[PDB]
Design a protein. Sequence first.
Lengths: 158, 621
Amino acid sequence: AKKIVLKSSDGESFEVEEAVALESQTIAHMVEDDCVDNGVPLPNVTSKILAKVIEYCKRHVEAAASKAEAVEGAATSDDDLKAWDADFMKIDQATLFELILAANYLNIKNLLDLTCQTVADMIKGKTPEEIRTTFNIKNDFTPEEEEEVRRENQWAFE
Amino acid sequence: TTALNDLPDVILSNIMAGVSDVRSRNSASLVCHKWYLLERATRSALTLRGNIRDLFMLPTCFQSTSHLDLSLISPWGHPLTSAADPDSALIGHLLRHAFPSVTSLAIYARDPSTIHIVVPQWPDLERLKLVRWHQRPQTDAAGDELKLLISECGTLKSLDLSSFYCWTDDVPAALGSCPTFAANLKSLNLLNSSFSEGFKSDEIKAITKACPNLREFRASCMFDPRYIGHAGDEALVSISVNCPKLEILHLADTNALSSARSDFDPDEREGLGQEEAKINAATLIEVFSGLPLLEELALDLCNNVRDSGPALEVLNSKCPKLKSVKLGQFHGISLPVESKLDGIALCQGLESLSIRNVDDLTDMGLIAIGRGCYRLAKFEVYGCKKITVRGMRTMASLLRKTLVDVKIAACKKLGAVQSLKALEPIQDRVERLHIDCDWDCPDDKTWARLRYVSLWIFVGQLLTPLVAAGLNDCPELEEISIKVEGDCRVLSRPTVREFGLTTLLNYPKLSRMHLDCGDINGYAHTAPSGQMDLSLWERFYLIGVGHLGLTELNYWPPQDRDVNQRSLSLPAAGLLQECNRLRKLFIHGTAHEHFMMFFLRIEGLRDVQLRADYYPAPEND
């Protein structure tokens, strides 16, 4: 089978299958030139982030293919992918943001969507002060502006 | 380390788009100016909250919302715009200024002038939902206001009249008035329970002929062969022929859409039903052969269709994309011989299956369905006399890898204890559940994923045995819906003081409740000796609701049919006033204005509304 190597920003090299690397639209794009065989360089991805990225991609392509196969009562991975996605996203905030940035770089739509939804779920059920504390955001709203925004928000059924 | 705010604006918009809960959106809009702009440019759905008299103070910040819901504006059901009012047209202009990007609209259509003034404000509108529970205004001809709407809503792709009261003669006349409007329709929802009689065969034929490009068709029809013009064999053939591109076909008898189980259950009806509908298996084969793109099928009839197994076998081959099936009073669903699968058991692509009133269904048939439909995630069975906890448990074990939403209702041999025992294999996996609170049926343990429980109970019965029935440890149970039905004009006064809502204190995460007592029939004020009036029944059912830490409550007061009132009483309002934790409270009925002033005493109560969403809605407002 065709295999490709990816070079992280810190010089590390990861050897992986071509098909799983095809998930990243950016990598698929640089495939067009000679760097497909000379080694695709990723100046904006670190070793740990790249390892997490190709782990997620490998699991998705595998279970994908796995589901491309099987005969009856065997797609139970669908939940597993989920359950595995849920336990995979149990990472610290900094690694989460780096994973988001790497997904935006490599243009892996599924991973980017999953990480953004993880952030959105982290948002749910928190007051503005709680959100500011969790994400370290400074409040630039004057009290009059806060009351105006609240008055606007009173026009929406909750 | 990188913080969230240093992320690119595209990523921030993607993150904000994932916040679907409106409260969290309101919270996030207050974090900072950048977050305010992101939330306002990202919000897509808005249900307008406020008073009609305050429409001039309408906010202009929601410029990106594509779905607008104007049906819940206060006072509920009031004409949003009246032609008699001189500055009515300005109101429409205001709306177009506040929400210029609306493509989906839901409005209350009490007055035709409201439609004529509001709907044409968005020429790019593609989905429309009309709501009306009040009486249909008198018109010279059928479909006059619908014809007006068609005139001002040319580019509409979806029309939703499932909560819009009108005569069934209105729809075909309006559709045939303008062929180009009907040709552009992709979805047509006419599944209205409030229709006195469903669409006739000729009306169905005209509707389907007018709209050839429908992907979704839902309608409440007249399938009872007693009446003249009942929908039958030719209506189904015409539906199949005229709309080959249907992806969803939901045809139901009007009585089947009623909330009261006495209206569709053949046992509860006093000899009604029990006869064959004018539907044959061969014609069902013909219809299913003509709908290759079908993905959802629902045929909920109030009359019997027997030996339908061969017809359902054709569904597996001729409808590869079929994932959901809902059948009502279809017989011969699964009649396995030796080990061969047949009928609905052949449909291996089913993800949801609803079964109602199948006399032939035994334990062997249920196990055959479980074997053949190995992909079932939702299963619903109603009124099957011959099925037993053995067969239901075997089916649950066979489907333990996918089954997450189970409903067992009106099963003679399956009570509350029986149902909870039968759901043992999926006890740790089931997420949504419905059981009937039948306590007199003659016969580790943690519900880890159970998030929603639906209960049906007869009037005068207690809720206390529920924990003894098997629903002991439900850590994740957040929402419970209780429906009470029965005629208490013949019931004696109960010997116990309270219904037993305090039993729900056994579940720590319970925060949302639906208490639907609207199908209780009793005496408003003049209960004879040995009986109690509706206020006393409201006390009996609502005692202890204050001790529950509920944040949302939907309550349906019991109704007196003779006086035609669904009123919230003094004792019931006093009991509801004890709920200090309520965030949202919706009463489906009428109440005195002092009663509504009572509830504003609650500090955290944000959304309060009296919603008479039943037919006919009171005109006293």
